[PDB]
Amino acid sequence: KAQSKRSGFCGQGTHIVSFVVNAPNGLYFMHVGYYPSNHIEVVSAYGLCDAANPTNCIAPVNGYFIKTNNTRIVDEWSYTGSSFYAPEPITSLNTKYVA
Amino acid sequence: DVLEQDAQIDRLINGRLTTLNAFVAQQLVRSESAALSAQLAKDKVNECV
Amino acid sequence: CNGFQKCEQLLREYGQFCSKINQALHGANLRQDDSVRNLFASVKSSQSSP
Amino acid sequence: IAFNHPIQVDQLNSSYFKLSIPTNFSFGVTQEYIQTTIQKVTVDCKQYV
Amino acid sequence: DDCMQQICAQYVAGYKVLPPLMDVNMEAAYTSSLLGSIAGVGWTAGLSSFAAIPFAQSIFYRLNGVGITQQVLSENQKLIANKFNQALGAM
């Protein structure tokens, strides 16, 4: 019916879609599953503190390529962040970074 | 006495075969239960861990 | 049998039943090995930190 | 022997945390068979036994 | 050989127990890989990406979202790590 969490019930890899077809004494399926394939190691920053409470959440996604401060989604190189995180300021441990 | 052996082997083989069949059946039931348990363990690592 | 020649010849008549018993146990052992491989495969395939 | 070694991401003492990022979509995977039902059959006492 | 220096196994040879497809070291390596990966997968990384975050940060993130305790309230709470250590010590 819909995309499902990776509890192993769905096919290995992130589940995008599943199709079911009749099989003798049972059921058979048709599918597409996302696989990362290639991994690049990039250090990720935690916002900035130029003045008072300028710290922001990294994003709904964990990714935050350091860049100049650009946010990153799950895959590929960083794109100019445009309020993708959309977060009201929160108290942050340390200085200059949320960490 | 071969005839004495034939009477003795009859009961002995029938008992040995039935117990061996029971041992195989017990192993198969344990194997099926273990396979279901392995699936639950896979789900447990996928979710709780 | 304890290796008695007479016992083995008597077993030859019932040999087919003995072969079926051995095959069934072999199938169970192979299934247990397959289940172990599937479980461990789910555990691995992650970018673990050292 | 098989090493079966996983990818290693070094933990960082500094506030910044290292990240692993996918580059290729590589969509697609195999399928599994449920075996929902077994063959349906009825024996006859006169024919068999 | 141990049969020669005296669950029968080789003794009657009615049967045999077979080795379990994996040495203890290989099984331990799989558990060790799972332990290291636990912190990264939890912080919204799924399987597509991994985050190299400390165990303390991962515990704090789980504690923050589920309960009212958050950043400042969580930092105000003290000996939370000690309570976790005491429970592990009881085990």
Side-chain angles (χ1 to χ4, degrees), chain A residues 24-25 27 29-31 33-42 44 46 63 65 74-76 97, chain D residues 9 15-29 31-37 39:
Chain A
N25 274 355
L27 289 176
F29 293 76
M30 280 70 43
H31 221 93
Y34 179 84
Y35 277 98
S37 276
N38 300 141
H39 273 291
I40 48 179
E41 306 295 333
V42 190
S44 45
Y46 270 115
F65 277 18
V74 136
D75 64 300
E76 295 191 20
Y97 294 103
Chain D
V9 188
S15 62
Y16 316 100
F17 59 109
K18 207 169 70 174
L19 228 65
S20 301
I21 296 294
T23 321
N24 281 358
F25 306 98
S26 56
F27 292 118
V29 69
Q31 291 297 16
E32 55 57 358
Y33 165 68
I34 312 292
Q35 223 297 300
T36 75
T37 183
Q39 193 182 27

mmCIF file of all heavy atoms in Angstrom, chain A residues 24-25 27 29-31 33-42 44 46 63 65 74-76 97, chain D residues 9 15-29 31-37 39:
data_model
loop_
_atom_site.group_PDB
_atom_site.id
_atom_site.type_symbol
_atom_site.label_atom_id
_atom_site.label_comp_id
_atom_site.label_asym_id
_atom_site.label_seq_id
_atom_site.Cartn_x
_atom_site.Cartn_y
_atom_site.Cartn_z
ATOM 1 N N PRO A 24 2.108 -19.674 -7.525
ATOM 2 C CA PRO A 24 1.431 -20.922 -7.179
ATOM 3 C C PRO A 24 1.452 -21.112 -5.656
ATOM 4 O O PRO A 24 2.525 -21.034 -5.092
ATOM 5 C CB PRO A 24 2.317 -21.994 -7.829
ATOM 6 C CG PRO A 24 3.047 -21.266 -8.938
ATOM 7 C CD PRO A 24 3.252 -19.859 -8.416
ATOM 8 N N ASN A 25 0.287 -21.352 -5.043
ATOM 9 C CA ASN A 25 0.198 -21.606 -3.577
ATOM 10 C C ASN A 25 0.858 -20.475 -2.776
ATOM 11 O O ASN A 25 1.498 -20.794 -1.760
ATOM 12 C CB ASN A 25 0.774 -22.973 -3.197
ATOM 13 C CG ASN A 25 -0.234 -24.096 -3.313
ATOM 14 O OD1 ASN A 25 -1.407 -23.858 -3.588
ATOM 15 N ND2 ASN A 25 0.213 -25.323 -3.097
ATOM 16 N N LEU A 27 2.274 -15.877 -2.908
ATOM 17 C CA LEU A 27 2.325 -14.551 -3.585
ATOM 18 C C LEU A 27 3.759 -14.217 -4.012
ATOM 19 O O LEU A 27 4.693 -14.655 -3.315
ATOM 20 C CB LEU A 27 1.780 -13.483 -2.631
ATOM 21 C CG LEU A 27 0.274 -13.521 -2.380
ATOM 22 C CD1 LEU A 27 -0.127 -12.486 -1.340
ATOM 23 C CD2 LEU A 27 -0.498 -13.303 -3.672
ATOM 24 N N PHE A 29 6.372 -10.831 -5.855
ATOM 25 C CA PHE A 29 6.361 -9.342 -5.816
ATOM 26 C C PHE A 29 7.199 -8.671 -6.927
ATOM 27 O O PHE A 29 7.909 -9.417 -7.629
ATOM 28 C CB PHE A 29 6.766 -8.880 -4.410
ATOM 29 C CG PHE A 29 5.811 -9.185 -3.281
ATOM 30 C CD1 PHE A 29 5.707 -10.462 -2.754
ATOM 31 C CD2 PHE A 29 5.050 -8.180 -2.705
ATOM 32 C CE1 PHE A 29 4.827 -10.738 -1.720
ATOM 33 C CE2 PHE A 29 4.182 -8.453 -1.660
ATOM 34 C CZ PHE A 29 4.072 -9.732 -1.167
ATOM 35 N N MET A 30 7.035 -7.352 -7.166
ATOM 36 C CA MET A 30 7.869 -6.550 -8.127
ATOM 37 C C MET A 30 8.310 -5.293 -7.351
ATOM 38 O O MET A 30 7.489 -4.826 -6.545
ATOM 39 C CB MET A 30 7.072 -6.161 -9.372
ATOM 40 C CG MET A 30 6.963 -7.268 -10.409
ATOM 41 S SD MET A 30 5.912 -8.676 -9.954
ATOM 42 C CE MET A 30 4.500 -7.848 -9.225
ATOM 43 N N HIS A 31 9.561 -4.806 -7.477
ATOM 44 C CA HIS A 31 10.016 -3.719 -6.550
ATOM 45 C C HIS A 31 11.136 -2.801 -7.026
ATOM 46 O O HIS A 31 11.856 -3.180 -7.971
ATOM 47 C CB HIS A 31 10.836 -4.363 -5.424
ATOM 48 C CG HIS A 31 10.628 -3.843 -4.043
ATOM 49 N ND1 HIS A 31 9.717 -4.409 -3.174
ATOM 50 C CD2 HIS A 31 11.261 -2.872 -3.350
ATOM 51 C CE1 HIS A 31 9.771 -3.783 -2.018
ATOM 52 N NE2 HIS A 31 10.707 -2.832 -2.101
ATOM 53 N N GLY A 33 14.197 -0.475 -4.868
ATOM 54 C CA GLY A 33 14.700 -0.111 -3.528
ATOM 55 C C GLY A 33 15.944 0.757 -3.605
ATOM 56 O O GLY A 33 16.878 0.370 -4.328
ATOM 57 N N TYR A 34 15.974 1.873 -2.870
ATOM 58 C CA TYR A 34 17.128 2.809 -2.940
ATOM 59 C C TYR A 34 18.364 2.192 -2.284
ATOM 60 O O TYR A 34 18.228 1.602 -1.195
ATOM 61 C CB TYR A 34 16.781 4.147 -2.282
ATOM 62 C CG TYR A 34 17.893 5.167 -2.274
ATOM 63 C CD1 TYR A 34 18.119 5.982 -3.369
ATOM 64 C CD2 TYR A 34 18.712 5.330 -1.167
ATOM 65 C CE1 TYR A 34 19.132 6.926 -3.372
ATOM 66 C CE2 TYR A 34 19.732 6.265 -1.156
ATOM 67 C CZ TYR A 34 19.944 7.068 -2.261
ATOM 68 O OH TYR A 34 20.941 7.998 -2.264
ATOM 69 N N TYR A 35 19.530 2.329 -2.923
ATOM 70 C CA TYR A 35 20.802 1.847 -2.319
ATOM 71 C C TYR A 35 21.834 2.980 -2.383
ATOM 72 O O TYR A 35 21.955 3.608 -3.444
ATOM 73 C CB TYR A 35 21.299 0.595 -3.045
ATOM 74 C CG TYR A 35 20.667 -0.694 -2.587
ATOM 75 C CD1 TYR A 35 19.609 -1.262 -3.279
ATOM 76 C CD2 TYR A 35 21.136 -1.354 -1.464
ATOM 77 C CE1 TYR A 35 19.029 -2.447 -2.862
ATOM 78 C CE2 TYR A 35 20.568 -2.541 -1.034
ATOM 79 C CZ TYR A 35 19.512 -3.090 -1.736
ATOM 80 O OH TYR A 35 18.953 -4.261 -1.315
ATOM 81 N N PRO A 36 22.575 3.289 -1.297
ATOM 82 C CA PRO A 36 23.520 4.411 -1.313
ATOM 83 C C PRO A 36 24.652 4.218 -2.332
ATOM 84 O O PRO A 36 24.986 5.195 -2.980
ATOM 85 C CB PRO A 36 24.107 4.394 0.105
ATOM 86 C CG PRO A 36 23.075 3.662 0.935
ATOM 87 C CD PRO A 36 22.509 2.616 0.000
ATOM 88 N N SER A 37 25.230 3.013 -2.419
ATOM 89 C CA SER A 37 26.288 2.678 -3.419
ATOM 90 C C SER A 37 27.634 3.364 -3.149
ATOM 91 O O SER A 37 28.617 2.634 -2.917
ATOM 92 C CB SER A 37 25.824 2.895 -4.839
ATOM 93 O OG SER A 37 25.116 1.760 -5.310
ATOM 94 N N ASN A 38 27.690 4.699 -3.178
ATOM 95 C CA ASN A 38 28.989 5.410 -3.024
ATOM 96 C C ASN A 38 28.907 6.359 -1.827
ATOM 97 O O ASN A 38 27.942 7.127 -1.767
ATOM 98 C CB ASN A 38 29.358 6.194 -4.285
ATOM 99 C CG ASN A 38 29.502 5.321 -5.514
ATOM 100 O OD1 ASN A 38 29.102 5.714 -6.609
ATOM 101 N ND2 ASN A 38 30.067 4.137 -5.346
ATOM 102 N N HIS A 39 29.893 6.318 -0.927
ATOM 103 C CA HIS A 39 29.833 7.165 0.295
ATOM 104 C C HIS A 39 31.004 8.152 0.334
ATOM 105 O O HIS A 39 32.153 7.710 0.144
ATOM 106 C CB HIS A 39 29.735 6.301 1.558
ATOM 107 C CG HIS A 39 28.333 5.940 1.911
ATOM 108 N ND1 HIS A 39 27.422 6.877 2.355
ATOM 109 C CD2 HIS A 39 27.681 4.759 1.885
ATOM 110 C CE1 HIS A 39 26.269 6.289 2.592
ATOM 111 N NE2 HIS A 39 26.402 4.990 2.312
ATOM 112 N N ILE A 40 30.713 9.433 0.577
ATOM 113 C CA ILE A 40 31.784 10.468 0.686
ATOM 114 C C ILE A 40 31.758 11.031 2.111
ATOM 115 O O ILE A 40 30.655 11.320 2.611
ATOM 116 C CB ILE A 40 31.614 11.566 -0.384
ATOM 117 C CG1 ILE A 40 30.177 12.091 -0.447
ATOM 118 C CG2 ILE A 40 32.083 11.069 -1.742
ATOM 119 C CD1 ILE A 40 29.968 13.193 -1.457
ATOM 120 N N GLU A 41 32.926 11.158 2.748
ATOM 121 C CA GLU A 41 32.955 11.612 4.164
ATOM 122 C C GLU A 41 33.089 13.137 4.206
ATOM 123 O O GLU A 41 34.142 13.648 3.783
ATOM 124 C CB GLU A 41 34.096 10.929 4.921
ATOM 125 C CG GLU A 41 34.063 9.415 4.822
ATOM 126 C CD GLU A 41 32.867 8.749 5.479
ATOM 127 O OE1 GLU A 41 32.318 9.328 6.437
ATOM 128 O OE2 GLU A 41 32.484 7.651 5.027
ATOM 129 N N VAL A 42 32.055 13.826 4.701
ATOM 130 C CA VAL A 42 32.083 15.316 4.788
ATOM 131 C C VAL A 42 31.785 15.736 6.231
ATOM 132 O O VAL A 42 30.792 15.246 6.790
ATOM 133 C CB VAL A 42 31.089 15.965 3.806
ATOM 134 C CG1 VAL A 42 31.291 17.471 3.724
ATOM 135 C CG2 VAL A 42 31.170 15.345 2.420
ATOM 136 N N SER A 44 30.249 17.913 9.185
ATOM 137 C CA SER A 44 28.977 18.683 9.200
ATOM 138 C C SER A 44 28.953 19.691 10.354
ATOM 139 O O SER A 44 29.191 19.274 11.503
ATOM 140 C CB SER A 44 27.774 17.775 9.215
ATOM 141 O OG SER A 44 27.944 16.729 10.155
ATOM 142 N N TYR A 46 27.159 22.936 12.819
ATOM 143 C CA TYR A 46 25.874 23.085 13.556
ATOM 144 C C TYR A 46 25.482 24.565 13.630
ATOM 145 O O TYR A 46 25.502 25.121 14.744
ATOM 146 C CB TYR A 46 26.057 22.648 15.011
ATOM 147 C CG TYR A 46 25.805 21.196 15.324
ATOM 148 C CD1 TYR A 46 26.833 20.374 15.755
ATOM 149 C CD2 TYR A 46 24.532 20.655 15.245
ATOM 150 C CE1 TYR A 46 26.609 19.045 16.072
ATOM 151 C CE2 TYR A 46 24.293 19.326 15.553
ATOM 152 C CZ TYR A 46 25.335 18.519 15.971
ATOM 153 O OH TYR A 46 25.111 17.207 16.276
ATOM 154 N N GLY A 63 22.100 15.724 7.609
ATOM 155 C CA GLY A 63 23.151 16.362 6.789
ATOM 156 C C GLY A 63 23.221 17.876 6.881
ATOM 157 O O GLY A 63 22.156 18.522 6.824
ATOM 158 N N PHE A 65 26.332 20.113 5.256
ATOM 159 C CA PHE A 65 27.732 20.230 4.766
ATOM 160 C C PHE A 65 28.322 21.551 5.259
ATOM 161 O O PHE A 65 27.602 22.564 5.255
ATOM 162 C CB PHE A 65 27.783 20.192 3.238
ATOM 163 C CG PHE A 65 27.775 18.816 2.622
ATOM 164 C CD1 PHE A 65 27.368 17.711 3.350
ATOM 165 C CD2 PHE A 65 28.176 18.628 1.310
ATOM 166 C CE1 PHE A 65 27.358 16.450 2.775
ATOM 167 C CE2 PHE A 65 28.165 17.367 0.735
ATOM 168 C CZ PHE A 65 27.756 16.281 1.469
ATOM 169 N N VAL A 74 19.722 14.086 2.155
ATOM 170 C CA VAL A 74 20.338 12.745 2.393
ATOM 171 C C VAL A 74 21.490 12.471 1.414
ATOM 172 O O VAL A 74 22.513 11.930 1.879
ATOM 173 C CB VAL A 74 19.271 11.631 2.372
ATOM 174 C CG1 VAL A 74 19.701 10.407 1.579
ATOM 175 C CG2 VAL A 74 18.833 11.243 3.776
ATOM 176 N N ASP A 75 21.377 12.858 0.137
ATOM 177 C CA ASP A 75 22.437 12.466 -0.836
ATOM 178 C C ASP A 75 22.940 13.631 -1.698
ATOM 179 O O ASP A 75 22.217 14.637 -1.779
ATOM 180 C CB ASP A 75 21.962 11.318 -1.732
ATOM 181 C CG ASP A 75 20.789 11.677 -2.627
ATOM 182 O OD1 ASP A 75 19.726 12.036 -2.084
ATOM 183 O OD2 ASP A 75 20.949 11.595 -3.861
ATOM 184 N N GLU A 76 24.157 13.515 -2.254
ATOM 185 C CA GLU A 76 24.729 14.515 -3.212
ATOM 186 C C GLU A 76 25.393 15.721 -2.530
ATOM 187 O O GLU A 76 25.361 15.788 -1.287
ATOM 188 C CB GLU A 76 23.769 14.852 -4.357
ATOM 189 C CG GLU A 76 23.491 13.661 -5.259
ATOM 190 C CD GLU A 76 22.761 13.977 -6.552
ATOM 191 O OE1 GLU A 76 22.786 15.150 -6.973
ATOM 192 O OE2 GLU A 76 22.162 13.049 -7.131
ATOM 193 N N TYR A 97 28.414 27.137 17.720
ATOM 194 C CA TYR A 97 27.759 25.912 17.185
ATOM 195 C C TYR A 97 26.750 25.358 18.197
ATOM 196 O O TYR A 97 26.921 25.608 19.404
ATOM 197 C CB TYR A 97 28.801 24.884 16.730
ATOM 198 C CG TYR A 97 29.607 25.343 15.541
ATOM 199 C CD1 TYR A 97 30.907 25.798 15.685
ATOM 200 C CD2 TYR A 97 29.046 25.379 14.275
ATOM 201 C CE1 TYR A 97 31.635 26.258 14.600
ATOM 202 C CE2 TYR A 97 29.759 25.832 13.180
ATOM 203 C CZ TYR A 97 31.059 26.272 13.343
ATOM 204 O OH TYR A 97 31.765 26.717 12.263
ATOM 205 N N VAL D 9 33.451 4.791 9.823
ATOM 206 C CA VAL D 9 33.380 6.284 9.870
ATOM 207 C C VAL D 9 34.008 6.729 11.193
ATOM 208 O O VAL D 9 33.455 6.374 12.245
ATOM 209 C CB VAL D 9 31.920 6.762 9.761
ATOM 210 C CG1 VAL D 9 31.819 8.270 9.599
ATOM 211 C CG2 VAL D 9 31.183 6.049 8.640
ATOM 212 N N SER D 15 33.466 19.459 17.781
ATOM 213 C CA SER D 15 31.988 19.624 17.757
ATOM 214 C C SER D 15 31.425 19.111 16.428
ATOM 215 O O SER D 15 30.338 18.503 16.446
ATOM 216 C CB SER D 15 31.631 21.070 17.968
ATOM 217 O OG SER D 15 32.145 21.876 16.917
ATOM 218 N N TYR D 16 32.135 19.353 15.323
ATOM 219 C CA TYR D 16 31.690 18.871 13.991
ATOM 220 C C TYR D 16 31.675 17.339 13.975
ATOM 221 O O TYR D 16 32.560 16.725 14.599
ATOM 222 C CB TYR D 16 32.651 19.362 12.908
ATOM 223 C CG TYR D 16 33.073 20.804 13.027
ATOM 224 C CD1 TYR D 16 34.296 21.146 13.578
ATOM 225 C CD2 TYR D 16 32.258 21.826 12.570
ATOM 226 C CE1 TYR D 16 34.695 22.467 13.687
ATOM 227 C CE2 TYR D 16 32.643 23.153 12.668
ATOM 228 C CZ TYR D 16 33.866 23.475 13.229
ATOM 229 O OH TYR D 16 34.258 24.778 13.331
ATOM 230 N N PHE D 17 30.705 16.744 13.275
ATOM 231 C CA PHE D 17 30.605 15.262 13.191
ATOM 232 C C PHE D 17 30.750 14.816 11.730
ATOM 233 O O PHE D 17 30.114 15.427 10.851
ATOM 234 C CB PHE D 17 29.333 14.757 13.882
ATOM 235 C CG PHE D 17 28.024 15.286 13.352
ATOM 236 C CD1 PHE D 17 27.168 14.469 12.633
ATOM 237 C CD2 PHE D 17 27.621 16.588 13.605
ATOM 238 C CE1 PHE D 17 25.956 14.946 12.161
ATOM 239 C CE2 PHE D 17 26.414 17.068 13.122
ATOM 240 C CZ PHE D 17 25.580 16.245 12.404
ATOM 241 N N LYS D 18 31.583 13.800 11.479
ATOM 242 C CA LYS D 18 31.824 13.328 10.087
ATOM 243 C C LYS D 18 30.556 12.660 9.544
ATOM 244 O O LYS D 18 29.818 12.061 10.348
ATOM 245 C CB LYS D 18 33.044 12.404 10.019
ATOM 246 C CG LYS D 18 33.749 12.382 8.668
ATOM 247 C CD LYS D 18 35.087 11.677 8.684
ATOM 248 C CE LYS D 18 34.971 10.181 8.873
ATOM 249 N NZ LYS D 18 36.286 9.509 8.745
ATOM 250 N N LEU D 19 30.316 12.760 8.234
ATOM 251 C CA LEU D 19 29.057 12.224 7.652
ATOM 252 C C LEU D 19 29.359 11.338 6.443
ATOM 253 O O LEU D 19 30.295 11.670 5.704
ATOM 254 C CB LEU D 19 28.207 13.416 7.207
ATOM 255 C CG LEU D 19 26.748 13.380 7.644
ATOM 256 C CD1 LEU D 19 26.659 13.462 9.154
ATOM 257 C CD2 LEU D 19 25.981 14.525 7.010
ATOM 258 N N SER D 20 28.576 10.275 6.237
ATOM 259 C CA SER D 20 28.737 9.444 5.014
ATOM 260 C C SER D 20 27.585 9.799 4.071
ATOM 261 O O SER D 20 26.429 9.687 4.509
ATOM 262 C CB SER D 20 28.733 7.981 5.354
ATOM 263 O OG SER D 20 29.778 7.677 6.263
ATOM 264 N N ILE D 21 27.880 10.212 2.836
ATOM 265 C CA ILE D 21 26.790 10.695 1.934
ATOM 266 C C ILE D 21 26.710 9.833 0.669
ATOM 267 O O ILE D 21 27.744 9.675 -0.006
ATOM 268 C CB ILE D 21 27.004 12.190 1.618
ATOM 269 C CG1 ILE D 21 26.885 13.048 2.879
ATOM 270 C CG2 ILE D 21 26.062 12.669 0.526
ATOM 271 C CD1 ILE D 21 25.500 13.058 3.485
ATOM 272 N N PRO D 22 25.527 9.282 0.316
ATOM 273 C CA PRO D 22 25.353 8.508 -0.924
ATOM 274 C C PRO D 22 25.526 9.358 -2.192
ATOM 275 O O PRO D 22 25.201 10.528 -2.156
ATOM 276 C CB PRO D 22 23.889 8.055 -0.862
ATOM 277 C CG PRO D 22 23.524 8.132 0.599
ATOM 278 C CD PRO D 22 24.310 9.311 1.126
ATOM 279 N N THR D 23 26.059 8.765 -3.267
ATOM 280 C CA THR D 23 26.207 9.507 -4.549
ATOM 281 C C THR D 23 25.366 8.870 -5.668
ATOM 282 O O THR D 23 24.970 9.615 -6.585
ATOM 283 C CB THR D 23 27.689 9.641 -4.924
ATOM 284 O OG1 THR D 23 28.430 9.892 -3.730
ATOM 285 C CG2 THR D 23 27.955 10.738 -5.932
ATOM 286 N N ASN D 24 25.075 7.566 -5.594
ATOM 287 C CA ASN D 24 24.355 6.882 -6.708
ATOM 288 C C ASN D 24 23.043 6.266 -6.211
ATOM 289 O O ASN D 24 23.073 5.604 -5.166
ATOM 290 C CB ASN D 24 25.226 5.822 -7.386
ATOM 291 C CG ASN D 24 26.221 6.401 -8.369
ATOM 292 O OD1 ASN D 24 26.258 7.610 -8.584
ATOM 293 N ND2 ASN D 24 27.028 5.545 -8.973
ATOM 294 N N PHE D 25 21.935 6.493 -6.929
ATOM 295 C CA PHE D 25 20.608 5.967 -6.508
ATOM 296 C C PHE D 25 20.565 4.432 -6.539
ATOM 297 O O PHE D 25 20.053 3.853 -5.562
ATOM 298 C CB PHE D 25 19.508 6.528 -7.412
ATOM 299 C CG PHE D 25 19.474 8.030 -7.529
ATOM 300 C CD1 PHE D 25 20.056 8.671 -8.611
ATOM 301 C CD2 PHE D 25 18.843 8.805 -6.569
ATOM 302 C CE1 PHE D 25 20.021 10.052 -8.722
ATOM 303 C CE2 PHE D 25 18.808 10.185 -6.680
ATOM 304 C CZ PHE D 25 19.396 10.806 -7.756
ATOM 305 N N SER D 26 21.040 3.800 -7.621
ATOM 306 C CA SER D 26 21.117 2.311 -7.708
ATOM 307 C C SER D 26 19.816 1.630 -7.261
ATOM 308 O O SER D 26 19.897 0.732 -6.401
ATOM 309 C CB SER D 26 22.329 1.753 -7.010
ATOM 310 O OG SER D 26 22.376 2.168 -5.658
ATOM 311 N N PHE D 27 18.668 2.034 -7.810
ATOM 312 C CA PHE D 27 17.356 1.483 -7.373
ATOM 313 C C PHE D 27 17.163 0.021 -7.795
ATOM 314 O O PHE D 27 17.711 -0.367 -8.844
ATOM 315 C CB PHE D 27 16.216 2.305 -7.979
ATOM 316 C CG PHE D 27 16.092 3.715 -7.463
ATOM 317 C CD1 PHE D 27 16.239 4.796 -8.316
ATOM 318 C CD2 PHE D 27 15.803 3.959 -6.132
ATOM 319 C CE1 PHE D 27 16.115 6.091 -7.844
ATOM 320 C CE2 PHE D 27 15.681 5.257 -5.661
ATOM 321 C CZ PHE D 27 15.839 6.321 -6.518
ATOM 322 N N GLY D 28 16.410 -0.762 -7.010
ATOM 323 C CA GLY D 28 16.065 -2.145 -7.409
ATOM 324 C C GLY D 28 16.533 -3.229 -6.452
ATOM 325 O O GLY D 28 17.688 -3.142 -5.996
ATOM 326 N N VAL D 29 15.678 -4.227 -6.178
ATOM 327 C CA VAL D 29 16.069 -5.390 -5.318
ATOM 328 C C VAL D 29 15.141 -6.578 -5.613
ATOM 329 O O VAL D 29 14.052 -6.343 -6.173
ATOM 330 C CB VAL D 29 16.086 -5.035 -3.816
ATOM 331 C CG1 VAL D 29 14.692 -4.787 -3.267
ATOM 332 C CG2 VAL D 29 16.789 -6.099 -2.986
ATOM 333 N N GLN D 31 12.710 -10.187 -4.672
ATOM 334 C CA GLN D 31 11.372 -10.300 -4.024
ATOM 335 C C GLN D 31 11.292 -11.600 -3.212
ATOM 336 O O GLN D 31 12.160 -12.470 -3.417
ATOM 337 C CB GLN D 31 10.263 -10.258 -5.076
ATOM 338 C CG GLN D 31 10.108 -8.904 -5.754
ATOM 339 C CD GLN D 31 9.712 -7.818 -4.784
ATOM 340 O OE1 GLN D 31 9.823 -7.971 -3.569
ATOM 341 N NE2 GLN D 31 9.247 -6.700 -5.320
ATOM 342 N N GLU D 32 10.296 -11.721 -2.327
ATOM 343 C CA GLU D 32 10.164 -12.922 -1.453
ATOM 344 C C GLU D 32 8.829 -13.629 -1.718
ATOM 345 O O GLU D 32 7.893 -12.955 -2.189
ATOM 346 C CB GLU D 32 10.281 -12.518 0.020
ATOM 347 C CG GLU D 32 9.295 -11.439 0.430
ATOM 348 C CD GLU D 32 7.837 -11.792 0.187
ATOM 349 O OE1 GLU D 32 7.578 -12.890 -0.344
ATOM 350 O OE2 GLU D 32 6.966 -10.968 0.529
ATOM 351 N N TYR D 33 8.752 -14.937 -1.435
ATOM 352 C CA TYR D 33 7.518 -15.726 -1.699
ATOM 353 C C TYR D 33 6.833 -16.089 -0.375
ATOM 354 O O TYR D 33 7.475 -16.747 0.466
ATOM 355 C CB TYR D 33 7.876 -16.947 -2.550
ATOM 356 C CG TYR D 33 6.834 -18.032 -2.626
ATOM 357 C CD1 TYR D 33 5.631 -17.835 -3.285
ATOM 358 C CD2 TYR D 33 7.073 -19.278 -2.073
ATOM 359 C CE1 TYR D 33 4.684 -18.842 -3.371
ATOM 360 C CE2 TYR D 33 6.138 -20.295 -2.155
ATOM 361 C CZ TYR D 33 4.937 -20.076 -2.802
ATOM 362 O OH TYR D 33 4.017 -21.080 -2.875
ATOM 363 N N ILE D 34 5.577 -15.668 -0.195
ATOM 364 C CA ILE D 34 4.835 -15.894 1.086
ATOM 365 C C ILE D 34 4.465 -17.361 1.352
ATOM 366 O O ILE D 34 4.540 -17.751 2.538
ATOM 367 C CB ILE D 34 3.615 -14.960 1.199
ATOM 368 C CG1 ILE D 34 3.981 -13.513 0.867
ATOM 369 C CG2 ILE D 34 3.009 -15.067 2.585
ATOM 370 C CD1 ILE D 34 4.887 -12.864 1.888
ATOM 371 N N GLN D 35 4.104 -18.149 0.329
ATOM 372 C CA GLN D 35 3.584 -19.532 0.568
ATOM 373 C C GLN D 35 2.314 -19.437 1.422
ATOM 374 O O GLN D 35 2.251 -20.116 2.462
ATOM 375 C CB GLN D 35 4.629 -20.441 1.222
ATOM 376 C CG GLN D 35 4.706 -21.839 0.622
ATOM 377 C CD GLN D 35 3.445 -22.653 0.780
ATOM 378 O OE1 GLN D 35 2.992 -22.929 1.888
ATOM 379 N NE2 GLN D 35 2.876 -23.066 -0.341
ATOM 380 N N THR D 36 1.349 -18.612 1.002
ATOM 381 C CA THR D 36 0.105 -18.379 1.787
ATOM 382 C C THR D 36 -0.723 -19.656 1.980
ATOM 383 O O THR D 36 -1.310 -19.795 3.064
ATOM 384 C CB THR D 36 -0.781 -17.328 1.105
ATOM 385 O OG1 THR D 36 -1.402 -17.927 -0.031
ATOM 386 C CG2 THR D 36 -0.013 -16.099 0.672
ATOM 387 N N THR D 37 -0.820 -20.527 0.971
ATOM 388 C CA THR D 37 -1.720 -21.709 1.106
ATOM 389 C C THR D 37 -1.008 -23.006 0.706
ATOM 390 O O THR D 37 -0.001 -22.925 -0.018
ATOM 391 C CB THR D 37 -3.029 -21.506 0.330
ATOM 392 O OG1 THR D 37 -3.874 -22.632 0.565
ATOM 393 C CG2 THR D 37 -2.818 -21.323 -1.157
ATOM 394 N N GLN D 39 -1.450 -27.259 -0.778
ATOM 395 C CA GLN D 39 -2.317 -28.003 -1.731
ATOM 396 C C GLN D 39 -3.512 -28.590 -0.974
ATOM 397 O O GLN D 39 -3.312 -29.089 0.151
ATOM 398 C CB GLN D 39 -1.511 -29.115 -2.401
ATOM 399 C CG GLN D 39 -2.190 -29.734 -3.614
ATOM 400 C CD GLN D 39 -1.360 -30.851 -4.197
ATOM 401 O OE1 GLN D 39 -0.580 -31.498 -3.502
ATOM 402 N NE2 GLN D 39 -1.526 -31.089 -5.488
#
